[PDB]
Amino acid sequence: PALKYGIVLDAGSSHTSMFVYKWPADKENDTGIVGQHSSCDVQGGGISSYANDPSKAGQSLVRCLEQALRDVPRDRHASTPLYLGATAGMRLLNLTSPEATARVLEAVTQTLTQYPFDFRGARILSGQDEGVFGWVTANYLLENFIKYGWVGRWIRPRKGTLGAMDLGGASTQITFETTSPSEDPGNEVHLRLYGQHYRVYTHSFLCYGRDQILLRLLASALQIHRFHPCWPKGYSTQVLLQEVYQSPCTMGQSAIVSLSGTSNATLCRDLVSRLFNISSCPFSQCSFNGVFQPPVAGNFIAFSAFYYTVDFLTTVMGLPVGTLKQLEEATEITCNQTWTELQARVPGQKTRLADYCAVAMFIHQLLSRGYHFDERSFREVVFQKKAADTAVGWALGYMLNLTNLIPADLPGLRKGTHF
Numbered sequence: 001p002a003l004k005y006g007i008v009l010d011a012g013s014s015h016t017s018m019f020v021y022k023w024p025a026d027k028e029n030d031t032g033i034v035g036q037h038s039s040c041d042v043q044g045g046g047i048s049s050y051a052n053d054p055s056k057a058g059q060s061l062v063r064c065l066e067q068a069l070r071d072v073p074r075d076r077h078a079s080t081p082l083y084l085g086a087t088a089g090m091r092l093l094n095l096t097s098p099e100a101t102a103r104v105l106e107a108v109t110q111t112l113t114q115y116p117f118d119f120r121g122a123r124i125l126s127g128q129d130e131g132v133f134g135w136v137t138a139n140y141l142l143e144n145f146i147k148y149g150w151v152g153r154w155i156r157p158r159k160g161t162l163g164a165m166d167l168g169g170a171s172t173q174i175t176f177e178t179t180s181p182s183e184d185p186g187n188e189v190h191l192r193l194y195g196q197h198y199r200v201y202t203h204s205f206l207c208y209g210r211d212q213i214l215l216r217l218l219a220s221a222l223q224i225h226r227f228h229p230c231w232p233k234g235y236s237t238q239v240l241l242q243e244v245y246q247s248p249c250t251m252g253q254s255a256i257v258s259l260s261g262t263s264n265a266t267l268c269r270d271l272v273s274r275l276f277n278i279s280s281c282p283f284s285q286c287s288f289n290g291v292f293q294p295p296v297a298g299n300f301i302a303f304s305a306f307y308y309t310v311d312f313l314t315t316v317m318g319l320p321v322g323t324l325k326q327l328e329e330a331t332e333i334t335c336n337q338t339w340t341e342l343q344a345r346v347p348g349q350k351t352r353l354a355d356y357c358a359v360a361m362f363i364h365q366l367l368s369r370g371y372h373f374d375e376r377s378f379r380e381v382v383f384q385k386k387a388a389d390t391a392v393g394w395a396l397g398y399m400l401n402l403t404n405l406i407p408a409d410l411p412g413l414r415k416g417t418h419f
């Protein structure tokens with residue numbers, strides 16, 4: 001079977017990853033057929049971290065692009081499409097400096113056009129794209145778009161689809177199929193996939209990614225407490241104020257100050273709860289910050305930093321997280337650890353360790369008070385980062401859309417048998 005290939009660079013706020021996908025030439029339109037062939041993690045920061053030195057943005061991709069030449073067979077280089085899609089890191093930079101944004105985009109374009117792949121552009125995704133393409137990825141890999149049954153006996157209602165929650169470094173997305181009336185066009189999505197219509201809700205909360213939330217909690221802690229109740233007792237660091245306050249997410253809230261943790265789970269909870277404005281809703285129902293959201297429903301996969309954080313809680317802390325009440329207890333126990341106690345659980349490298357308490361607490365509030373999961377809906381949420389040997393994220397769904405590999409309708413409308 002002759003294989004075709006495709007490459008997406010996911011240029012996220014904190015890192016770039018390259019994914020290489022392969023599929024058989026003559027089965028390319030079947031759902032669930034495309035899979036991941038390989039991947040590469042670019043060393044250092046995301047492309048937006050090179051705003052003041054844009055040529056390094058392109059250079060940073062070279063090691064992974066060299067790997068792609070070895071991963072994809074040589075006779076196939078020229079007809080392999082390559083895409084770069086950039087997310088909230090580049091969206092935040094476009095707020096600060098559209099000129100610096102264009103120069104970063106020009107530097108990666110210039111590097112990518114030097115390679116023999118069919119280079120199809122470097123683009124910034126909208127938040128909607130980001131959310132919807134992650135939802136397409138998860139459901140395509142799990143074959144949720146197959147029409148189940150057979151003639152004279154189709155399953156009814158049709159197979160449910162998996163909602164997607166993506167916790168990135170600078171934004172977070174929530175996307176799910178819904179039968180609720182749409183009250184905000186900015187959230188409303190209609191897809192036509194394999195002959196079927198899917199009514200989907202999506203929203204992207206810019207500045208509610210993990211790294212921007214950790215910055216906002218640091219600015220907040222500095223302002224209200226002059227200690228960090230989410231960091232563990234005995235941990236301290238020298239905080240550079242210009243770094244804290246340069247983000248568009250924190251400029252809302254001495255060059256160096258010392259800041260220490262206090263392991264105070266209750267003050268940590270109070271600090272995180274200030275992130276969610278629930279006072280005002282111009283719609284019949286909101287998530288938070290005045291944003292329209294219909295009731296969460298169906299199964300969900302929570303990936304990226306949702307997965308990594310819960311995996312810390314289950315695997316390193318040894319704590320169960322099957323209910324919202326367990327996840328909340330796991331958070332308190334984590335936040336109550338001292339720095340020596342936390343460090344004694346992690347024999348190897350400790351980067352991110354002081355932050356798990358804050359992120360876990362944000363995730364618990366995001367789900368229960370942001371999105372209004374309760375014990376009943378939360379039971380339908382799985383934390384996973386892979387499906388069918390393929391990393392879950394927006395890259396695959398992006399590549400599928402741009403390469404036109406999901407047909408709106410089946411061939412001949414399958415003789416109309418699905419009508």
Ligand SMILES: Nc1ncnc2c1ncn2[C@@H]1O[C@H](COP(=O)(O)NP(=O)(O)O)[C@@H](O)[C@H]1O
Binds near residue numbers: 011015087088169304
């Ligand atoms: N091992 C880990 N433990 C906890 N968090 C981890 C992790 N590995 C990556 N992450 C976090 O996932 C997030 C991935 O986000 P990105 O794709 O870089 N940000 P965006 O442009 O999608 O908004 C980062 O915050 C990263 O630090």
Ligand SMILES: [Ca+2]
Binds near residue numbers: 012013168169
């Ligand atoms: Ca991301």
